[PDB]
Amino acid sequence: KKVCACPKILKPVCGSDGRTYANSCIARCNGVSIKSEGSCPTGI
């Protein structure tokens, strides 16, 4: 129940914790910034 709503577009990001979230809005809602655009490589 809010006037704001996050986007539903398929544009995921790697957060500075090294997790991937579905978009920039959901990433910021955890209290953390985006390290880069796109999903990140699990091999590093």
Swiss-Prot record:
Keywords: Disulfide bond, Protease inhibitor, Serine protease inhibitor. Acts as an inhibitor of human tryptase, trypsin and chymotrypsin. Probably acts to block host defense mechanisms. PANTHER family: GEO10195P1-RELATED, SERINE-TYPE ENDOPEPTIDASE INHIBITOR. Residues 1-42 form the Kazal-like domain. This is Leech-derived tryptase inhibitor C. The record marks 8-9 as: Reactive bond (tryptase). The keyword Metal-binding does not apply. Disulfide bonds join 4-29, 6-25, 14-40. InterPro entries: Kazal_dom (IPR002350), Kazal_dom_sf (IPR036058), Serpin (IPR053265). GO terms for molecular function: serine-type endopeptidase inhibitor activity. The keyword Metal-binding does not apply. PROSITE patterns: KAZAL_1 (PS00282), KAZAL_2 (PS51465).
